[PDB]
Amino acid sequence: HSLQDPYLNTLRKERVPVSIYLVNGIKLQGQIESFDQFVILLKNTVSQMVYKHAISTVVPSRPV
Amino acid sequence: GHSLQDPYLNTLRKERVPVSIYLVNGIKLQGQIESFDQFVILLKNTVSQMVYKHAISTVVPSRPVRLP
Amino acid sequence: GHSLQDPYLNTLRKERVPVSIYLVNGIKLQGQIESFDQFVILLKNTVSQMVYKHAISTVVPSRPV
Amino acid sequence: HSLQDPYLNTLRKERVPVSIYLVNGIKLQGQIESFDQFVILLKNTVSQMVYKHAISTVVPSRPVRL
Amino acid sequence: HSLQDPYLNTLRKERVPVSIYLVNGIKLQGQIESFDQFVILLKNTVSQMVYKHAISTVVPSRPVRLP
């Protein structure tokens, strides 16, 4: 709570490219246009709604 | 409790966009969202397929859609 | 929170549709749904086997319902 | 749990050698000694504790009624 | 917890070299140092910590009888 929501808010307000590595091993590219408690939107080339449980890690493209 | 999944799914349903669901296993399914819920999603194909939420990884619409 | 799962599963079980339950690990189970719960389901392809919900991925009905 | 609890209890009281297929493919064999909301006990020379969130299926070696 | 804690605390008190098989098929060895509701600790040279959502099974080396 004290970390996830502020971190996602900072990632969104900065429009930084965010690489979301899923638990399956795929590297999804794009920016977090918005985020929810269960799904995160990663839009850059095509709309996407990556579910939270299927997200292993989320690395920014530059310092935040 | 969520406020972004329900409207997104309702839009993908009413606009009847060719949706592609990629599961955590690493496969692909194609079809339109006929109905959604807190734990299941019906996908239209040769035979309606009930995909569970906990198994879905990504839901990509074949065309860009705008939020309400 | 099951307004869509419970009716579908109940219809598939009553109508005795040979469904195929694709799990998360990629295995393709088969058999008719005997009785479903909130966290477990029962199949009878050869014997009464209990499949856990959290391990299920999709349920393809062999006949359109 | 209207089916999980009675099913597990019937498999326990009768001491039916059940085969529990986990998620990663490997299968364990043995009778159910005791079970909980998140743990089952397999007796097959070593009383091991399998986790509910890791089990995929549970097939009895012989048919069982309900 | 009616049957989970009575087993983990027993293993802890008895110091049984338990083998934990995770969900991804990887095996770990060691004694339970201090189990919790979410994470368990191992008593190896590094004192690894394994979450209770990635553990598939926990098999003891010696048969443990529930008290």
Added chain:
Amino acid sequence: HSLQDPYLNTLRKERVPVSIYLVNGIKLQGQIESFDQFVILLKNTVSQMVYKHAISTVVPSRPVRL
């Protein structure tokens, strides 16, 4: 979470170079900068957010206790 919170806090304060092994197999390296319900911010030159539901184990590397 009686011991998880203090353990992670001790690993954070001391800036211990932990090694977080996920469930899929890949391992990440870096000191724990902060943690919260279903999230750990691993910061070591580059920042990353690893979800706990996807983490399998956390080897502290150095002998560190609560």
Added chain:
Amino acid sequence: SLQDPYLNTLRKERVPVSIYLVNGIKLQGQIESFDQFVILLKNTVSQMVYKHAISTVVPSRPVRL
């Protein structure tokens, strides 16, 4: 209104009944008579049960009126 014919029938045919009071306990027996507030239940002993304290009255066998 229906209580009067119901109890009259349960008393005529001498059907074994089971009363369930508010507190939740069950009393098996056989109705002997009924009034506006009291009912005589006989099963080895004859006891007077009060209407306001009764919750349900299940006949042991199917009965209509």
Added chain:
Amino acid sequence: GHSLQDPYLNTLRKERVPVSIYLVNGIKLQGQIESFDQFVILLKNTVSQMVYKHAISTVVPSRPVRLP
């Protein structure tokens, strides 16, 4: 009204039959019915306790009694 309650209560009172009353709470008082009206009953026990009708559930007599 009470065409069957009084013929029984006064009968138990006259013969001084030891009866056990069962309050609505679930416990059980014991003793002989000393006096009773349309609202309350009195137990002849040493304490001379008074019980309220609406709080009573059943009145089991220690011995069978004939209905007048």
Added chain:
Amino acid sequence: KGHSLQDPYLNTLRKERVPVSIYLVNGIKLQGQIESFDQFVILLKNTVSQMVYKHAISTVVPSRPVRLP
């Protein structure tokens, strides 16, 4: 005067034969289908003809949505 809203609701529940619950004050979970309701009694029709008093009921939860006339 005392059943302006209870009488039609119970009559509709009985006509539609919708699964009713009829919770008691004790908190027990009854069920069945109301066959006929009077001033102080409700005859639930289930596996066996049952009679439940009004003063011991605490809730009437129909399983399906019903509309009052």
Added chain:
Amino acid sequence: GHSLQDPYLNTLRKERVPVSIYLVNGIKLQGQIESFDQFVILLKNTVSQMVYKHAISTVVPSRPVRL
């Protein structure tokens, strides 16, 4: 009706005998009945109270009392 409740409570109030009122929940109040009335009884004790009739189950006079 209510032909016996009046004299009993009247005497219990006149003699000021300490009575114990047992309610329907099983709780027990203790003190002197200061004033009896329909649908309500007034208790007397440290931090007096107003007990309702429909909630009372029994009234034990503790000490012997006659009607």
Added chain:
Amino acid sequence: KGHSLQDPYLNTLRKERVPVSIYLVNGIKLQGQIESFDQFVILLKNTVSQMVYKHAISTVVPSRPVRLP
């Protein structure tokens, strides 16, 4: 049955559609809005039309205060 407080309060809670919480004698807590009430029944709305009896209700607390006539 001659009261001058319950009727206006319930009518205000109904017309305003305020989230109400009903605690029964048994101690069970129901939550929802009122559809229609009478001297012996109250129709609560919360995914179902729940006819809760009057005598089985102990307290009724609204989520926010309301004005009286």
Added chain:
Amino acid sequence: HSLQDPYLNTLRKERVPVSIYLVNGIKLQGQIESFDQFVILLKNTVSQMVYKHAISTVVPSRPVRLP
């Protein structure tokens, strides 16, 4: 009647913080906002309607005298 109405009117006018104990044994708190022949509105950050047929008793936190 003779004792309920004056007592309740005094408790309301004086605004005594009373505690209403229900039939189940639960304890409530607040000042008597209003009373009626069947219900009572008790205020304490929220006006709750408590039914008279579910009130075991009322304990005034301050001594009160009848009129």
Added chain:
Amino acid sequence: GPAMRIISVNVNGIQAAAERGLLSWLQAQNADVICLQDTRASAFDLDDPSFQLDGYFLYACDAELPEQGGVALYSRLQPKAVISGLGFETADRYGRYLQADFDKVSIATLLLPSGQSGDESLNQKFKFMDDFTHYLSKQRRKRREYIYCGSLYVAHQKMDVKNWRECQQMPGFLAPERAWLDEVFGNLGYADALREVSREGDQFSWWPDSEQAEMLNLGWRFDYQVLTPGLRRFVRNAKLPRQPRFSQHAPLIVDYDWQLSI
């Protein structure tokens, strides 16, 4: 002293036992409650004063057909209340259950179908067992100590039957019946009265009609006194006198230090 004796004697027809002298033997044999089962007669038949003993009450519950089943019960003092219902089609329709209540102690005359008559009887027995285990699991909440005078038609362990090697196939000793009886005496916590005081073999309570098994003592223990763990400590002694047998089963006499009361 505060002794309490209970006699459970299956008669396979009260007529034969009364002809052999069970009535007089019981009237002479001091006891408190006789759990005699398998009456095979209607209530109007038991009402005959010929069966009614002196100083002992009579209660009986029969099925739709008098010979289809039915169970009766005697008692020294008038029980607090008697109930002739269990809630199962396999119990009420056959009149196989009747319970009498004294001060926080309930005695029940349980009667399970033999099953040797055919496959349908075995299926009915299995259904009755599967329902009775659930009934027991539901009754664990009550605080009253129960004394089930059961004719389970099932042997628990090896000592309960001679030449088990040959009986492993005959009904009354199969695997599911054994598992059910062990679960009753196992997880559920109940304990048998006879096996508590005398942990020795050869104490059988049934023999086939052929006198060969009787001469060789080849018999089973189809009679049990199931006691709630609360009453397990009050078991003073148990006996299975075989000589004064009035039917295929033998009278099972259990004495406790408990003192019942109206």
Added chain:
Amino acid sequence: GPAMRIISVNVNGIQAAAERGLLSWLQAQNADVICLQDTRASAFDLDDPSFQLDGYFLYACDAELPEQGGVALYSRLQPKAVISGLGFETADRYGRYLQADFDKVSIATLLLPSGQSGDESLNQKFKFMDDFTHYLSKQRRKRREYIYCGSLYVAHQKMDVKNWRECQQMPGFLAPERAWLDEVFGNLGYADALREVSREGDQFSWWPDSEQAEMLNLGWRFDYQVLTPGLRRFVRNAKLPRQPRFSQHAPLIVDYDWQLSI
């Protein structure tokens, strides 16, 4: 910090204590609730403002006869409830028990008969003891955390009295009395605060009328703080000021962590 104090002064007649200036000693001793035992006077006598300490309430229940018994109780604030009697003829008719409930706690004053006067006194003592242990067993499952700060006139262990071998035949240390007290304590799970805070010997409260006995310290510990095991964790300390010895008993004072409130 959070601290509460309780005092126990068996005045053995409030008149004698007041004659020795005990009122001023109690007034100086800051306490939340004072439980003096054995008033030997009616409630009308205690109503005298002389015994009423400023800032402390006055409650008292008198026996059928003044000198026979009677108990009193003082509270710094108005208690939520005050009750007397236990249904027993040995308590109600003598007012030897007076309870006061505040919130989350209930402090009681108890006076058991010395039993040293005659044989009838010891018989009544046995009766009161058995009835009181019955009542307390009936009170174990309750929610109220009772503290029966009372005089039992019975020594529990040898640590409460020297030369116990000689006191074996003397009342207060008799085998049945010690057994009853040990059953009230351990079997039911109750404990004492004074021993809990310090398991030290040579600490007594009662002393015979002989002066040399007090000179050589020959006393018994009869006043106890029978305290439910729930609140035993909040006990701080306990003292036994043997300097005054104004009366036969001593001012057993105990301070706890819990704080009472209206």
Added chain:
Amino acid sequence: GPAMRIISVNVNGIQAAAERGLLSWLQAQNADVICLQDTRASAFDLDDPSFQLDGYFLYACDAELPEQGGVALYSRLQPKAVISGLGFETADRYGRYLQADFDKVSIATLLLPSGQSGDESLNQKFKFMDDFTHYLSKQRRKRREYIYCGSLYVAHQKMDVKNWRECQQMPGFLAPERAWLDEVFGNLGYADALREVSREGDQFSWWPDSEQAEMLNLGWRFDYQVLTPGLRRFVRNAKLPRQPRFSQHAPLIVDYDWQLSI
């Protein structure tokens, strides 16, 4: 049949046992193994052939202070190996333990200090018990079953002591000892030998030196054949003969169906 008779006895000094004639009586009684607790003699003293019986071997562990303690043990056949140790300081110093291994069965001559002498003895006993609980928690893993023929000097239940109301404070029966015994015989699962073969009272094994207690039958049960749950089923008979008294205690012969062998 395979009757293994174990005879456990506390000689309270081998000198007194030899004087009263324990050797002859023990040799007369057919038994596979005999445990002698509290020898009060050094190993060299036991070397005398007077104590060596025909057909039996001589094993013994002597305390550091010979008079403080010491244990012995004879068996009919050469055991696999003798383990004259335990691990704790008290055991190693006072030689209060000696073990003999056999086929899947091992007999231990345990001896807990009586604690009847003084306070230091009671403290040593408490320490020995708080260590033996750990020891038994450790031995709970190995496969071989154990038979501790030990004089625990602690009575378990009321059946082991008459007039328990009086002995509620005598050493060997206080609350902590009772709790420790109940935990060792319940939580750990080490079922007793007497409470499983004969659930009757008056089975005393200890008697004070005062002849009054002997005449009145006032005695305590201190000897114990502690059995691993694996051996509980192998119990048959166990009776305590008091007429052949050779020390403060009395023998405790117990016959088992298990048969030992090298």
Added chain:
RNA sequence: AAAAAUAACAACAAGAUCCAGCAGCAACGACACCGAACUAC
């Protein structure tokens, strides 16, 4: 958000630091991890 129901508590001053040891596992779940999505163990 409700025990398809306690034949019934002489009664809750009151709940919203090492196995005296198996005639022995055709072999340990193949060893503590070795960083753009493809549907039978």
